[PDB]
Amino acid sequence: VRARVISHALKDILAEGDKVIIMGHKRPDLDAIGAAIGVSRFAMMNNLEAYIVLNETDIDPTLRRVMNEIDKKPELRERFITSDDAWDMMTSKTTVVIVDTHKPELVLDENVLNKANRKVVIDHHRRGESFISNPLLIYMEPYASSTAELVTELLEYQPTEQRLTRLESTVMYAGIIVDTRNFTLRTGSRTFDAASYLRAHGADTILTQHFLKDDVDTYINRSELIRTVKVEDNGIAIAHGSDDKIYHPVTVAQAADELLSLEGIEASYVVARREDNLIGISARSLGSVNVQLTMEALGGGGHLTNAATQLKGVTVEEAIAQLQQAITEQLSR
Amino acid sequence: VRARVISHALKDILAEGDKVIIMGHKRPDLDAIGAAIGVSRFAMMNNLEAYIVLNETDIDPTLRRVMNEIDKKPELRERFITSDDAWDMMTSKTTVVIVDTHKPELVLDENVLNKANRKVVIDHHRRGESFISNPLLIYMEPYASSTAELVTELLEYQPTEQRLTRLESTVMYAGIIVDTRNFTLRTGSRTFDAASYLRAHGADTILTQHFLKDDVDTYINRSELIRTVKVEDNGIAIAHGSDDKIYHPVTVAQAADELLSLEGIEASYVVARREDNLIGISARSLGSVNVQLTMEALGGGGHLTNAATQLKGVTVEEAIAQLQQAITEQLSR
Ligand SMILES: [Mn+2]
Ligand SMILES: [Mn+2]
Ligand SMILES: [Mn+2]
Ligand SMILES: [Mn+2]
C-alpha cells in the first residue's frame, strides 16, 4: 500500500511542474539507466514531458551496447539529452528526479542538481551524511535489490494505455540482473514480483545476456589463474599467475570471486604479479574463514569476505610462501 | 485460473483416499524432488498423510547434498520412504501422485505405480506416446518452467496454517533454478511469481548455490576446451580438444554452453575425442543459428539451440573440416 501512495504522490508532483528531468549517478550502470527509463515511462503514461540526462562521456562499453539498441527506436532515443541541453531547458518549475543515488556529489551532473528547485530521490542504498537538499518526495528502501525494482512498483499503479515497452522493460530487467548478480544477491520476493511485471511486458532474456557478455580474452586470462588452484582439506584454495606475467587487478579479483563458485572452496587466495616489483593477492571467503586477518598480516586489508594486499619486492613464489605462513599462523590462532 | 480449479480438485482427490504416495522419475533431479516435496506440503496443509518414494540407489551426488542438509537441519527425512515400504503401505484407496514425468517406464518405481488404483499426474513436458494409465487428474502444462513452478501455484489456494518451511521452499526453488538455468530458459512471469512465493517462505538462494557447485576438475577441463575457441565474424565459434586427449561428454556439453556467454558468439561447436575411435561434437546457439540442422548434416541431431553428433574413425582435425563444410553449406548466404 506504501508503493501505491508513493506512486500517486509522484504523479501529482510530476504533473505539477512544467516537465521532468531524470538523472542517476556518475558513470551510470544498467540499474541507473533502467531506473531512469522507468521514470520516463512513468511520466509518459501520464502524458508528461520527460528527459534522461546522459553525456557521451558517460557511456562505458556495457552502456554502449544498450544504446545501440535504444538507437533503433526514436521514441526512446529522443528522451536522452546532454547536461547542457538539460541545463538550458530547466526552469524553477522543472522536477529533477534523482535515481539510484542520494548523494549530491555522486549525481551525474551536480550543476543540473544545483539548478533544480523541485527534486525527487528514488534509491535503494543506505543513507549517510550528505543527501539531496529539500526533496519533495523520497522513496528509499535499503532492502530493495535495485532502483529498477522500486520504480517498477510505482509503474503498477499508473494508467496503462501507454504501457512499458519491450525494450524499456528489458533495460530495467537487466539493471536488476546486474545489481542482484542474477538473483543471487539482495534478492527478495519483491525483486521477483518486479521481474514478473517486467517479464509480462516482454523483458527479453537473450538481449539482457547480450548486454552482459564477457570478452573471450578476459575469460581466458581469468582461467589461466584458476587452472593452477590447489585446495587444501580445510577448504583453503590458492591460485597463482606465473612470475613473469602481469595480470590486470580486475582479472585477479574475478578469479578470486570465481573460485568461491567451485565445490569445496571455503576461501580463495589468488597471487599474481601486478608490476615489475609488486605482487598482488586478492582474497575471498564464503564467510567462515576471515580473509581480512590474513591480508592484514601481510600489510593489506579489506573485509571479512573480501580483502587484498600488495607485496613489494618479492617473486610470486615468495609471495605464495609468505601467504602460506600467514595462513598457518592464523589457523593455529 | 486453471491453477485454482486444479488445486481444489487435487485437494478433493487426496482427502478422498486414505493417504498420498508421491513419486517422480528414475534418477530424480531437484525439480522432481522439489515438486514432490511441494505435493507433500500440499497434503499436510490439509492434514493429510503423505510420503515420497526415494531409495538410496536413487540418490546422485547433487541429491546427496540436499539429503545431507535435510538430515542435519529439519525433519523432512521422515517423509521419505523406500519402494518396499511404499508397497507395504498402499491400499486400493491410496492416491499415488506422479510428479515431473508422465511415462510409466520412467516412474521411479513402476511396481508402486501398477499397484495404485488412484493416480494423479503433474508434469511440464510435452505429452508423448506412453502415458500413465487412467489417472483421476492430469495437470500437464508444457510451457511452464518446471514441475516446481506448477506445484507452487497449487499451494497458493490451500489453507495457510501449516506453511511451507524454509528448507522445503529452498529445494522447490532449486528445481526451478536447474530447470531454467537460473531464469534464462523457459521463464515466464508465472515462473517469477512462483519464485516470489518461494522466497517469501524463506527459499535460500545461497544454499541453492551450494547444492549446484561444479567441481574444480570440471572447471579446469572445460576451460582447456574454451581457450581454443576461434570466433568467426558471423558469430560461429569452434573450439576443440587435441586429438590425443579424451574428454568427458559432460565437459564437452558444458564447454559449448559456456561459450554462449562470451562476446560475439551466436553459435558454438565443441569438437573433442570421446573414444579411441569416436569424435563427439556438442553444438549450442542463442536461437539465430539452427545447430540442429548442422548436426543433422553430420549424422546427429537434437534441437534448434542444442544438438550433438558423434563421428566414427576420424581425427579431431578431420571432424573440424567436416563441420566447417556443413556450416558454410548451411549458411552460404
Ligand atoms: Mn548503480
Ligand atoms: Mn542500483
Ligand atoms: Mn526432471
Ligand atoms: Mn522438470
Automatic annotation (TrEMBL), chains A, B:
Alphabetical keyword list: Cell membrane, Heme, Hydrolase, Iron, Manganese, Membrane, Metal-binding, Nucleotide-binding, Transmembrane, Transmembrane helix
Top-level taxon: Bacteria
Keyword Heme: yes
Subcellular location(s) per record: Cell membrane
Membrane topology per record: Multi-pass membrane protein
Reactions the enzyme catalyzes: 3',3'-c-di-AMP + H2O = 5'-O-phosphonoadenylyl-(3'->5')-adenosine + H(+)
Cofactor comment text: For phosphodiesterase activity, probably binds 2 Mn(2+) per subunit.
Top EC category: hydrolase
Chief place of localization: membrane
Cofactor(s) this protein requires: Mn(2+); heme b
UniProt entry tagged with the keyword Metal-binding: yes
UniProt-annotated binding residues for 3',3'-c-di-GMP 2: D257, S282, R284, N306, Q310
Residues that bind 3',3'-c-di-GMP 1: P249, S282, R284, Q310
Residues binding Mn(2+) 1: H25, D29, D100
Binding residue positions for Mn(2+) 2: D31, D100, H124, D179
E.C. designation(s): 3.1.4.-
GO cellular component: plasma membrane
Known function: Has phosphodiesterase (PDE) activity against cyclic-di-AMP (c-di-AMP).
Protein family according to the UniProt entry: Belongs to the GdpP/PdeA phosphodiesterase family.
Name under which the protein is recorded: Cyclic-di-AMP phosphodiesterase
Higher taxonomy: Bacteria, Bacillati, Bacillota, Bacilli, Bacillales
Residue range from the parent sequence: 325 to 657 of 661
